[PDB]
Symmetry: C5
Subunit: 257 residues, 5 copies
Amino acid sequence: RAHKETLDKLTNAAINSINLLNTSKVKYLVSSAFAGLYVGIGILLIFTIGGLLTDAGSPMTKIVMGLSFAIALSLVIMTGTELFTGNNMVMSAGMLNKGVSIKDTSKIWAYSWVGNLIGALVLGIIFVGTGLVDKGPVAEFFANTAASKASMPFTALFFRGILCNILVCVSVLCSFRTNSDTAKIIMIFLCLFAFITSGFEHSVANMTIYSVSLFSPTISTVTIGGAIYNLVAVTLGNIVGGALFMGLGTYILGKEK
Amino acid sequence: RAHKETLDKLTNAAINSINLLNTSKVKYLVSSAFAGLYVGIGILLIFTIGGLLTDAGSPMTKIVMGLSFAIALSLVIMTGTELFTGNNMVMSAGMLNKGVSIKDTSKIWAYSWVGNLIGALVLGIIFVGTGLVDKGPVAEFFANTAASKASMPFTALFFRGILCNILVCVSVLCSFRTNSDTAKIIMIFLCLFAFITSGFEHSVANMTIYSVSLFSPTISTVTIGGAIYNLVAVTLGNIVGGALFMGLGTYILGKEK
Amino acid sequence: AHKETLDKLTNAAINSINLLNTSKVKYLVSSAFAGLYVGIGILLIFTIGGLLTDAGSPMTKIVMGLSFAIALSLVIMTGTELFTGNNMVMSAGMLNKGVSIKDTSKIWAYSWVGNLIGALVLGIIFVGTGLVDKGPVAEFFANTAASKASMPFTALFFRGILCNILVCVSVLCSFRTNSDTAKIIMIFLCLFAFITSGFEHSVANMTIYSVSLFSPTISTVTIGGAIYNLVAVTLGNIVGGALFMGLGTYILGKEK
Amino acid sequence: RAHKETLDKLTNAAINSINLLNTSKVKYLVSSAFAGLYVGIGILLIFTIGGLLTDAGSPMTKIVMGLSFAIALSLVIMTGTELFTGNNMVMSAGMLNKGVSIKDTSKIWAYSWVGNLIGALVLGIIFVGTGLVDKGPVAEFFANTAASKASMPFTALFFRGILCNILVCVSVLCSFRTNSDTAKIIMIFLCLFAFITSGFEHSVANMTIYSVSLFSPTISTVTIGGAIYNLVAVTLGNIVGGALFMGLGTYILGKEK
Amino acid sequence: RAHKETLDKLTNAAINSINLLNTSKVKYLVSSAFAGLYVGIGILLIFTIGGLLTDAGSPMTKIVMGLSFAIALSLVIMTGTELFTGNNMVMSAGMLNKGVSIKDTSKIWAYSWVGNLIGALVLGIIFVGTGLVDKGPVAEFFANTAASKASMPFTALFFRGILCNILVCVSVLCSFRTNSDTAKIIMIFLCLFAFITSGFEHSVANMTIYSVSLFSPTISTVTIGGAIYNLVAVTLGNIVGGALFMGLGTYILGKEKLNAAAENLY
Ligand SMILES: CCCCCCCCO[C@@H]1O[C@H](CO)[C@@H](O)[C@H](O)[C@H]1O
Ligand SMILES: CCCCCCCCO[C@@H]1O[C@H](CO)[C@@H](O)[C@H](O)[C@H]1O
Ligand SMILES: CCCCCCCCO[C@@H]1O[C@H](CO)[C@@H](O)[C@H](O)[C@H]1O
Ligand SMILES: CCCCCCCCO[C@@H]1O[C@H](CO)[C@@H](O)[C@H](O)[C@H]1O
Ligand SMILES: CCCCCCCCO[C@@H]1O[C@H](CO)[C@@H](O)[C@H](O)[C@H]1O
Ligand SMILES: CCCCCCCCO[C@@H]1O[C@H](CO)[C@@H](O)[C@H](O)[C@H]1O
Ligand SMILES: CCCCCCCCO[C@@H]1O[C@H](CO)[C@@H](O)[C@H](O)[C@H]1O
């Protein structure tokens, strides 16, 4: 039971993050851009899988996709780059613990969110240039998924955003609670398996879904307005999951009061 | 063999548990709520898998479910949160070893059970909010499974509860006997694989099964009375498995006379 | 590091007899746990056997093998007393003069009986679940028990030999590594090999027969059949664990 | 984050590579040759798989290929041999951090490329000598893939080269950021799964694809020209991903300014 | 790097190996017998899989077989027993580094080879005793495979031996380069997956294939003549892959070329 020690670590991570931004916006945005790109790589992989298996009428499609998404957050954690969603639990916890302020928190959130988007846009442009979404089941999978994500009612997206960032943030929490990098990766694998296959919504992964779909000439299904709609609802849910549940929760567990 | 060392660890853990509760009810309940919700996350995943594969008439359904449940107790162990079924072995061993009283034991059992339920209820509510059990295979898998669990004879449920918590508690026992976080997860993975696929009954997991089934307007195959009937029977079996077998068993192995 | 490994087996054999001498209750409880833990693996893979056989899957025996790891993993990770592993440990320690032949047949008899008690307890409770009342799982239990009891002695014996080479070698590996993950992986590999290849394990068979005989579901087994298989497989296990692994590890580690 | 220490490790690794070359061309070229062959060994495996599953009409072909390619970079990393692609991030980061010169960088790039090719040629010759590509589904998978890679448009190969080496190099980046050899291998497995299954292009791996196809008398439709066309386009893409993204990126993250 | 330390370890191993053989021929042959039998255990498993999936017309057959062969070298490495094929790299490297002599080498190679063969025969004899190859797809898989290996052209068998032992030895090489036992097993799992599925030939493993078939009663369609053929070709291949490639390779990488006390790099 190292709840106190854990809260200390979260607090210290929150302090490191705002310090980094204060020290250098370039370093912070480059870090954020890597993470958004790393997450997008997971999307490129499982949407390829989605296309191959959906085309095949496989009933295992969504299961194989969940099993195969682990690389997204594994890369972020193993490279120590800045990810908006995890920042929800970290900043909220550290703020509550008086290590950082409400101002530092909204700042980290806004920069990391925008920086992650930069990575998704860059990934989308390059992926399109591969010609891999020119035509076929993979392009179709992007188009249909982007459309479904954009036409889904707000309430549903929001709540899917909550459960998603509970899983993402708890996998980040595990990485703070162990010294085994392998166990970190395993826990990340399990959590991303759970959230992808269950149907939960991640704001940063979705950036790449819309990035690819919008930059691609072969895909005329969704528009920027749709992307913004989905992203706003999912981002708000992510925040509630990561800050209101995980952040507030771990503070309460760890706060020597 | 380290049987004494293990008993000392169990005894320490029991003491630390009752101290947390005595120190702060809010912390204890928040911790319990977390565990309940983490276990529930496993149910959402494997029930999604259930619906998917059952609809397709796959023979692998229950095997894939068992293989995919690991996250449930993996999250509990890696976050160090209070789980009722695990507390059955810990408090019991510690009690026999005079580390904690009978009253402490009943108190810890009652609070964790309720806290676990709070987490299940919350998860259930939010999950229904996702729209993910609005219609289709997953909703039907929840409704049908909840029903078959609620109509099964008491004796059958009881004994399934015994075998389940032997497995859950032995997976917890293993984590007290290794310093390797990966080995803990692996053993947890194996144990949950065994108890899910074999057909054994877990009270805290069942909490989420019924919270979803009752909170969802598209699920009316069961009633509160049914959920209560199952929970009582299964809880009773869980307790026997955890305290009578694992608790007393580990006490006997490690008690220097 | 053969020498140090022999030392480890010798100390383990010494610890076993000392435990039995100090407390029969503790030794039999430990034994009962191991038998139950192994039985748990049988409950899992026979559930799988039922499900996949019913479906005419060619992968049935391959999935059973991959899924049996929990059986010896639980034993190893809980530090409980398993008969089959004891065949190598005691024989090695015996040849090394850490324990006597008398100690060895005493440990072998007590762990065997204690393993059985675990199997019986498990069978009874598992039948109580109603999980083998009817269906392909109950049928897989009945059919497997029946085929194992009717098989010729010589076949069971040699299948018992190869099974315990694999089981005891996985135990040997656990003495040669400080990594718990490595132990479990080798156990996984070895049980995969012995289940899927079709070798026979006495202790696991105990649960096969306690379940089949405790279940009112009609089979062609009988107690005479169970005892037959158990005797044939146990002797086989003993040769493979004692004559091969026990003797071999002693020869490798003995400074002579 | 340990960005400074990471950049420091990259720089020392770059310094060590040029040192080795300057000390002994034979040593460096033997190391390079090993890496090229180790990578080629991955190709023999997944192209055997590709053949078997292609001939079966399995929709899982590319998924199984991706999952089975881990050995390629795992061997390189575990043997500490010189691989051209990974050298793109390492020499560029080290060069930006003023540990090695631009000349050292293009020297290491030229020598490791040629060394890698020699391994691929040695492997290709020996493989053909086994008679495994005399005829059949594996021979045809080598023949057809070599052709489709040689006839693909430059821009598509280029961008696929970029994304491939971001994945290879980030997997190399991870090996620099953990002391766990198991975690190194898991991350390599993930990154190679992602790049293979997604369809990205790797220059060194293609060397073996073309050595096998060209050395094989089992008639096909490639030619040295087509091989040169593909290798040039993919190599340039690899360089951009490894140097311009990963090298520059990690340099900015860890630079003391 | 760290090739120099690795070369030291290979040299020390070759030394320990010849010391043991000189200390006790009984201890060395028992070790070699274990290793041969551990490898064969892998064959019994994956050949059972062969039969089961071949008879079902599965396309995943050779993939599942490759994935399932890891136990063979995993047991050898984890038990620290003497396996002929690994000895090709070890002895050759140590020899080049002047830790052991050409005579020392050929003696280890000869004794380990024979020791491994003993384990296979003993394993084959016991396996047939199970009746598991009395009749059916598994018995047939052994028969058919033993035939094809015995009736394959020499050059092909030779080159398949080379690539096999490159893969077997590089996995042994990885075990010298890591302190993580789990990573050792994983790398072994990968290399044996690759070598089995790709279709390369391992001499020691083939000792059990022919052992089972020549001790098996249900027909032959083979002949010891075939076994000797295969075993001879594959063995020379193994030695080349292990000694010429991996042995010489690691030496070159790790020999600090100050010394030079004899030869010059460039
Ligand atoms: C490529 C350039 C990216 C620029 C992103 C800047 C996002 C600014 O975001 C704003 O930052 C303020 C502090 O400056 C905070 O007070 C606000 O809460 C926040 O919205
Ligand atoms: C975070 C959401 C991703 C925003 C990426 C916007 C990139 C838009 O990209 C543009 O989209 C237009 C239509 O939408 C197309 O007509 C253009 O061809 C395309 O370049
Ligand atoms: C949401 C608030 C949850 C409070 C749960 C408290 C229920 C306590 O319940 C009782 O606790 C006693 C000790 O206090 C035990 O002795 C009794 O066995 C138990 O029934
Ligand atoms: C895909 C599942 C494979 C899991 C492989 C587990 C590899 C973990 O590796 C193990 O990690 C431990 C940390 O707990 C360390 O103590 C051990 O030294 C190390 O071998
Ligand atoms: C421990 C078992 C969980 C009990 C939670 C009961 C919450 C019930 O909740 C109610 O369920 C009714 C039907 O069941 C619905 O008609 C109502 O809309 C809903 O509010
Ligand atoms: C639940 C009761 C089970 C008790 C099992 C006791 C079996 C004793 O077994 C016997 O023990 C003797 C020494 O006591 C040895 O000399 C014999 O070799 C051994 O067969
Ligand atoms: C047998 C294989 C020998 C290969 C030696 C390659 C020598 C490469 O040499 C390098 O080439 C670079 C461009 O190619 C130049 O930029 C460098 O100045 C030059 O040193």
